């Protein structure tokens, strides 16, 4: 039963694999490895930089120097040390060509991207000090680029959108921001999977405050934000909360994070959830931020996620001359970027949908961070939460079913889950909710519960006769998915073994029922019922709960 030592192992040098995954590293749509995009850039307003042998001479491609750095500190460090050292060095570079307001700072985006490829090449050994370094670092960089993150909601008269149609530097700023927010996500991840015996370090008031300023610059309630940064900021909020739970000695750091500071998170995050999605004009200047757009004028994927078309990634395939040592880079253009494939809008909206899954689940995570709570959840996480829950009931009904699009099932699963969030709030966090706010939203609460309730008996099919017709009229997308998973996307789900389609006929059927407002899992239905029929609090008037229920029975 020996498992033999292989006396001639060939075990990789992961720092070497890293050196590779750097020198080859290419952003989505680029002509070059983005490292080489660096490697064709000399800049004339930094004659000579050094931090620790990183001379970007007066005649150096910022690449030339950065790749050379990869080589030097490759010879120097071991893996964790090299992660830390590229962090520090590439950062202090990002500063010295970011706080230098007259030079071509297009190294900076891919430098941040390099932060990303670093931290998320070896999030195993990356460590708190340089984590916070790059974190706070590009945070202050985003405070450097106050202009784009805070551009007037509609350019009020005086302010004009007469911009040089320039995703050129628009890319520079936006790219840095989103890439670095994804780097914040990955830093949270190194600590997020890091042992929770050691969670008192990468949390500090400086993390919080830098994020204050940058979060507020991105979720610009007064100006016209962009959806990559909105995604990214709310994702950072999300992982922040994830660790607010996954920190064991939680009371101390929950004291450290200010209650008013989560509050200033969630004012803007409720603001988000109440901002909406106008696909037909998502690639056009729409209404005052109540229309998440990610306009083609500022449009690429992002790093742990690909929401746009990344059309402007193609113009990164014209980002530099690719035949010239450019001093300032090749245009990317806001006008050129963006009847062709509204699947573009559909996948991006499937994101924004998953975004609001993130939002609901991290609102939910807040719900857990406090069992006994404070100003962030003061019945407001019933007000705004159930307001979203009922807004999505009303939208799914009034349009989205029949609108019968890719969104349907994902949205219905996640808003029934936000129903469940309402449920556990109204049961365990039932302690907080006081009269003033249960009166501000008695409406939403009671009738959202009532809507889900008018279903359980379901005398229609209770089977797969023509509720499968419904599975075709709306769940046709998930029918394409059952086809695709059985024919393309499962090693075993070809030649079904006859104990699974017996289940399919009803399971996918109640999936499309949850799409079409009915036949939610008995779990779901009694969740919704018990939220309302909890007579322990007179949410319902006992003499009229009969008039309520008699829409179904009871």
């Amino acid at each position: 039963n020996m498992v033999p030592l292989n006396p001639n192992r060939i075990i990789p040098d992961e720092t070497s694999l890293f050196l590779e995954s750097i020198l080859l590293h290419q952003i989505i749509g680029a002509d070059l490895s983005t490292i080489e995009i660096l490697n064709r850039l000399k800049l004339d307003y930094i004659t000579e930089f050094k931090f620790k042998n990183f001379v970007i001479a007066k005649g150096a491609p910022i690449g030339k120097s950065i790749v050379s750095l990869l080589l030097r500190c490759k010879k120097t460090l071991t893996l964790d040390r090299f992660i830390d050292t590229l962090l520090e060095d590439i950062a202090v570079l990002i500063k010295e060509i970011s706080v230098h307001p007259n030079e071509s700072k297009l190294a900076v985006p891919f430098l941040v991207a390099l932060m990303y490829q670093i931290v998320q090449f070896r999030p195993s050994a990356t460590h708190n000090l340089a984590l916070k370094d790059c974190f706070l670092f590009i945070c202050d960089l985003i405070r450097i680029y106050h202009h784009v993150l805070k551009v007037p909601i509609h350019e009020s008269n005086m302010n004009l959108h007469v911009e040089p149609q320039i995703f050129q530097y628009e890319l520079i700023d936006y790219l840095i921001i989103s890439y670095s927010f994804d780097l914040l996500e990955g830093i949270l991840r190194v600590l997020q999977s890091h042992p929770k015996q050691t969670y008192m370090e990468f949390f500090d008031e400086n993390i919080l405050k830098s994020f204050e300023f940058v979060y507020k610059l991105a979720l610009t309630i007064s100006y016209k934000p962009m959806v990559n940064v909105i995604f990214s900021a709310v994702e950072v909020v999300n992982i922040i909360t994830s660790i607010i739970l996954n920190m064991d000695n939680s009371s101390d750091l929950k004291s450290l994070i200010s209650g008013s500071w989560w509050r200033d998170c969630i004012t803007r995050l409720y603001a988000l959830l109440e901002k909406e999605i106008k696909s037909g004009d998502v690639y056009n200047e729409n209404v005052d931020t109540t229309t998440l757009h990610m306009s083609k004028y500022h449009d690429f994927f992002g790093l742990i996620r690909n929401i746009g078309d990344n059309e402007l990634g193609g113009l990164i395939s014209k980002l530099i001359y690719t035949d010239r040592l450019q001093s300032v880079p090749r245009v990317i253009s806001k006008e050129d970027i963006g009847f062709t494939a509204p699947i573009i809008g559909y996948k991006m909206e499937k994101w924004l949908l998953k975004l609001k899954d993130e939002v609901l689940n991290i609102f939910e995570n807040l719900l857990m961070i406090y069992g006994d709570d404070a100003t962030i959840v003061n019945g407001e996480m019933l007000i705004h939460s159930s307001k979203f829950l009922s807004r999505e009931q009303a939208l799914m009904i009034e349009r989205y079913v029949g609108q019968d699009s890719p969104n349907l099932d994902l949205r219905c699963h996640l808003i029934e889950h936000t129903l469940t969030i309402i449920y556990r709030l109204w049961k365990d966090h039932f302690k907080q909710l006081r009269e003033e706010q249960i009166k501000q939203v008695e409406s939403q609460l009671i009738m959202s519960l009532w809507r889900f309730l008018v279903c359980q008996t379901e005398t229609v099919t209770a089977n797969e006769r023509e509720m499968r017709d419904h599975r075709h009229l709306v769940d046709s997308l998930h029918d394409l998915t059952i086809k695709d998973q059985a024919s393309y996307y499962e090693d075993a789900f070809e030649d079904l073994p006859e104990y699974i389609e017996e289940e399919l006929k009803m399971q996918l059927n109640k999936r499309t029922g949850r799409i079409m407002q009915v036949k939610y899992d008995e779990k779901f239905q009694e969740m919704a019922r018990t939220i309302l029929e909890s007579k322990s609090f007179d949410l319902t008037t006992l003499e009229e709960a009969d008039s309520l229920y008699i829409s179904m029975g009871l």
Partner: protein, 615 residues
Amino acid sequence: ESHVKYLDELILAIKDLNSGVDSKVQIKKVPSLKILNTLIRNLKDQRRNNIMKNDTIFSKTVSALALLLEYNPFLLVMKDSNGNFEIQRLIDDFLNISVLNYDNYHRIWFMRRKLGSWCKACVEFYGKPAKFQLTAHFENTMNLYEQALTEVLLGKTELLKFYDTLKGLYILLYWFTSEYSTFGNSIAFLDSSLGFTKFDFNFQRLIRIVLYVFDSCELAALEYAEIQLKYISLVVDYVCNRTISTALDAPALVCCEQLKFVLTTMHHFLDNKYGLLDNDPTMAKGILRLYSLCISNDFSKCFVDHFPIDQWADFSQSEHFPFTQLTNKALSIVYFDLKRRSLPVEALKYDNKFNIWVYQSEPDSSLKNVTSPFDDRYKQLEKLRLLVLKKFNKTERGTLLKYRVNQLSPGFFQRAGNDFKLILNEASVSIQTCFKTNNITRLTSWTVILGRLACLESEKFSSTKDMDNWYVCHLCDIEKTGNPFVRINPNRPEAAGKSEIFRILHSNFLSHPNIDEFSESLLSGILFSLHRIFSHFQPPKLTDGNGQINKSFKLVQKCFMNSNRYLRLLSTRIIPLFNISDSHNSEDEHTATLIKFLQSQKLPVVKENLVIAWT
């Protein structure tokens, strides 16, 4: 064994025990905990080998047992407890039955989706406190497994025990390699979304540390071959759920970092070759899954660059690549497609033997696997082949909803295929004859086609908009905000006048002798049909003055008198649709009629979708 009927008796008993009242969940405890012995025995005897490995009968008996614990929801509100967590002394023997079901992807997805319900949902009554201790014990188990994975690097373990330790690795792993719809905050690391949960790259770290452990410790058994080829299967099961599920086109990825990660991972596994196994379509399955994910989308340079197999090419042979027979076959397929759109495709022509574009393969043949099929009647294998190969159709490479109008009755594009009128007339003649008493499945797919095709004859009058370009409609199906019915403008065309779909549908699904009630759900189907056809097309009068509500609004009313949400709310949505108009909303005669209609009923079932319709 007749213990099928023994479990049948137990499930009949639990079905009998509903609740204090007819409706049967009872979220909170009812201390009456009588089926306690049977519930424990469900898993107490699951550790056997007689019919505990069967499916069909025993499998549905276990599905019924899951419904019994939801019919009792949570008895822990006042009872059902243990020293640590009882929900964990459930999960652990569930993972024992998992290592029993270790290989069957069927038996693992079903079991962990129902236990998903159990944890992500059937404790989601509470959330915080139970979830906390559940996650604690989960992390304990993970750390134990990781510490056991070390000393096998040096030989002082068993053989079956090593196999099963690395298999328990895999079982944790697949349990963890689904998308959100399978868990939630129950487990610490599957809680977020948008390209990351606290798992995804805890998991990439898992995968890379276990590649370390594999290149460190190995053995030459074909079962170990399997428990490694399953690992490449899972490292692409990592990405399959991390896709935006793009309808029917190979699902684009949410996160190109899963893309690069899996590229690097299976390419280093091309390197490893640890545990070759015969008769294995898993290898090429994974490679073609990923290439399908990487066909011609922006991920193109991504895949070719971060997973270049090409350097095993060797045109000069008929035994082409060195991994395994059918693997190397499909991999030369993917290779050869790569070369295909690399070189000038004018050098390719459709040679029509298998009708895929082929460039100059070579002067000599040297292409034993250029386009041939190979499978033991494996539809998935040959469909991988066909989709990837014909993906450069340069003709009808589109559709999803219109492609579904054709998927049910396959063999249906044997003609123009693009043409609206062929499906027009075929669904016409179908509802004209194709039922006797039971055509309530295929006729239903024809009604979903009728709705989609109304939305398509809407997509037109705007050069090429036929079945070709159709993932979903615009005026009905691109989701919006604001007053959505702002989009729906009355200058639209008259329904019957500009839709023979309407003419003969009004004849058949609306002048039906049993339209009153033949199949509640089919009724609601043609209901959404009317919904969309009207959203695109001007409304004919509901009532012509002298009565005769238009045998469709009649359906609106009658289903509006349903007994639950279903037909009722499915009716409600379209009242406004008839209202948005002109020349029938001219003197708002339609408006006043439907106002009187919303006040022509008070039946208690319908107050809700009444308030909807009014809204």
